[PDB]
Nucleic acid binder design. Sequence first.
RNA 1: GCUUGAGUCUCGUAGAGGGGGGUAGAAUUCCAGGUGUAGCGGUGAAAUGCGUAGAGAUCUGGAGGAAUACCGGUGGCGAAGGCGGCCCCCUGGACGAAGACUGACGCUCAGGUGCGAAAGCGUGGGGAGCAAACAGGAUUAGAUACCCUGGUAGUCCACGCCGUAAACGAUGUCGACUUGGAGGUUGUGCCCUUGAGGCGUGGCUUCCGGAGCUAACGCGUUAAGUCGACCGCCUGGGGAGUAC
RNA 2: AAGGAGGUAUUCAUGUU
Lengths: 88, 129, 104, 70, 259, 67
Amino acid sequence: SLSTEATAKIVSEFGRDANDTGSTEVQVALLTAQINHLQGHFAEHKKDHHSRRGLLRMVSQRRKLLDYLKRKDVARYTQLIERLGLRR
Amino acid sequence: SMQDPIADMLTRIRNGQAANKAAVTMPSSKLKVAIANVLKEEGFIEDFKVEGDTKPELELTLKYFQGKAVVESIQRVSRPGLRIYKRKDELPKVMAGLGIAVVSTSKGVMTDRAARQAGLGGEIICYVA
Amino acid sequence: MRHYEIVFMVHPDQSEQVPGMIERYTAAITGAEGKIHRLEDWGRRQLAYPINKLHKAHYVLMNVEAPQEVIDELETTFRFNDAVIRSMVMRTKHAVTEASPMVK
Amino acid sequence: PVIKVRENEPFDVALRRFKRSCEKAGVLAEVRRREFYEKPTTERKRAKASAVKRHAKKLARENARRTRLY
Amino acid sequence: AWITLEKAYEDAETVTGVINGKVKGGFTVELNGIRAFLPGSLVDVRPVRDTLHLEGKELEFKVIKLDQKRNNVVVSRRAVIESENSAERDQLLENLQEGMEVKGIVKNLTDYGAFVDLGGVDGLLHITDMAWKRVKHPSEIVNVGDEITVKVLKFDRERTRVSLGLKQLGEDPWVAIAKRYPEGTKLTGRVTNLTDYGCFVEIEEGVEGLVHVSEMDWTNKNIHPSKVVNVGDVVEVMVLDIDEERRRISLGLKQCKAN
Amino acid sequence: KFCRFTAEGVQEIDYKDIATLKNYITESGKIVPSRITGTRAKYQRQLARAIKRARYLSLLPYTDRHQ
RNA sequence: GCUUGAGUCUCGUAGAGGGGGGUAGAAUUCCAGGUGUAGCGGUGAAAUGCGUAGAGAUCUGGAGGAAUACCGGUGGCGAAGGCGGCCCCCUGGACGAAGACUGACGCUCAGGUGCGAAAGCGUGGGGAGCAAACAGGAUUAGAUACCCUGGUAGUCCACGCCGUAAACGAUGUCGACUUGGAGGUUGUGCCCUUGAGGCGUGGCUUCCGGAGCUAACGCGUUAAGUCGACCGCCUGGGGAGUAC
RNA sequence: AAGGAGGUAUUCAUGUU
Ligand SMILES: [Mg+2]
Ligand SMILES: [Mg+2]
Ligand SMILES: [Mg+2]
Ligand SMILES: [Mg+2]
Ligand SMILES: [Mg+2]
Ligand SMILES: [Mg+2]
Ligand SMILES: [Mg+2]
Ligand SMILES: [Mg+2]
Ligand SMILES: [Mg+2]
Ligand SMILES: [Mg+2]
Ligand SMILES: [Mg+2]
Ligand SMILES: [Mg+2]
């Protein structure tokens, strides 16, 4: 999973204080970092179907969070999917 | 998921009466309080109250007459999956008039008898016997 | 850095190389910013079952905090250094500095 | 089960010790279990059945102390 | 009654209680719900071949201890022994059988030595003080209660403990070897104990020499001794050095091979 | 029966302590059941791991007959 | 707007969860030797079979493949299929304590997508044991079987198919409510830990059971009581899960 | 193989063995 220090950096970048961990932006950013990390693992481990099920949950959760953000405040959504380098 | 808090309140009353509990409690809402007032004024429950500031809890003290529970049956009629509305002429008569149909008219929620006298239709929340 | 409990057992007739081996491995670990927390040369012990028809082999124990890469290299050294008969590296969650039951 | 003959111990006494030692290590039961292959489903079924009947007999006994037979 | 049994022990009570029997753990007692422990010299007072009076038949239960967690008492027939043993062991701790240069009345075989009581004291000793073979239990010279001979070495007479030695008499094999076996003589010996750093081969009665793992093979320095010679095998080794002071024989197998 | 690890506060059993582990193997060298020894299930699992690690390092024998 | 549903962060805990790579010991088989000699093996009883080119047995060394005794448990983990030596590397989920944060972000889901025992299929490996087909020997009125001696594909690996099972709890997922008891397992709080004690509070789990439900068997707070949301299916038996 | 006893089973010092 994601290290303690890596989570701390991301929370600082996307949250409006060190204690803002529940923001949609922070949640999407944490999910995106972990999703991007696991690509190397599943490049070497094409047969790890159990771990891949966990990864698909993460991808699915990021879509739900982005849908909420787009419907709730479109400007934050465009800014976020631009910083995080995500299509749609 | 909870998707019918009115049915949940009816269910708690039904289960509490069947289990001979003195009072039942549920999370509160203004629709629940309105239904509770109709029940109290028709004599199906003994009393109700609401306690709590941010997360109010509605408490109903149930009624038993000769050891037996007073509410013989209580069923949600209109439900999220199928809403029921009736015109003033088509209001139901629960138990040939010996029961009440809680009907949410435009002038508030009342019994079938009160709405029929006031010349209104509306949504039928529940049947109570 | 992770913690490692490394126990390797040497040929009884290479007993005099154990000091040297200890220093090399300690130097390798410590050069990679390592932290040797415990080091117990248990000495010549009677094997419970004959290994390669070799009773009475020389046990060494070493508890270490070091990067994974240096630990991998040390395990490879074991694989090739045909004086160490057996080795076992285990990952420990915390450092242990207390004397082992085999010390006394 | 490696029994060493003790001093003054007669052969019958030593032999009783050896037989009990083997029965304690369960050698003969192990060999009888490994004579033939049994499917994992058969093994699980047999294990579950023994547990069910053992539990039922314990409960039956623990209720038999309740009542008198005469 | 267990309270009263502990209180009667506080009185040094010598009661008529049912002994618990004879066992390798000494002697058991049984005082009305108190199973008593006592050692092999304190399990009964009768020094005979069947002490069932002390343990196994209603007999002396002595005041030796009261242990809640052990459910235990001093299960040994007191009020007989150690009583006159006061003056006897006074004369003993004054004499000790000529300062332990004396015989003793054996007790049993122990896991660390062989013990002969004195009657006011009680000594022990090693098993290899009257023999030299690789021993584990040396009791095969007498039964329990026989008369053995030892010389006193370390005796604590303020605790009633003794330790005599059995080598204060026997001619030293080492002295005859020093005149009989000069360095460089080859003789045959039987491997009594084998190690990875050396194998102990008994060449003569009571003489064990250490042949180093480096002296097992000149041309294959990495050969376990356990793979070349088995414990009990008879091998010819050349005496390289004799350390009489340390009672050590350095034996060389390397001289049979070629460097 | 009473577990001798819960009453001592032991966190990890340790495979380098060949005195406790010898009490928990039989003469043949197999691990004694927890039903006999009264050890708890959590410490039983730790204990079995420690015995297997000790066997690999030849601190304990796998069986009574290979030696 | 709000914080109670749903999520995030902080510290730990247990686990045959998954993938990759190493290694250990026992055993089976084969090979080469030494000792040794007339049987071995198999069965209800035999025979085929192996053995004087020296078997079986016993000891020593070697090769190789496959699986991990004991622990082991109506124990645990996983959505299911399923997962069992020990070590390392990569990785998924669950739970608990206290606190902070977001502020309904939820539930269900046709179509679709993915995973999915064993057998089987393709391509190449590997092959100790076991073993369809097959060969022989018996049994039998017959024996294309059960029994015996062998024995190929297959079982193992890598990469692709296949998509199915009594894939079963024969019990769709989510949520709420409704008397109890004895246990297991994994956390945590408190009290005198007086010494494995006492007292609480969470998760998962086995067995009894009350009201109520059940044609009945049963079920029962992990329902098959009482309710709500959404999806899947059923409409006599055979023909037939067949034809087109 | 047959019977008897104890339990759902052990705490029952270790040592000795
Ligand atoms: Mg997370
Ligand atoms: Mg579908
Ligand atoms: Mg297959
Ligand atoms: Mg194939
Ligand atoms: Mg092939
Ligand atoms: Mg066959
Ligand atoms: Mg099907
Ligand atoms: Mg299945
Ligand atoms: Mg099943
Ligand atoms: Mg079905
Ligand atoms: Mg039931
Ligand atoms: Mg078809």
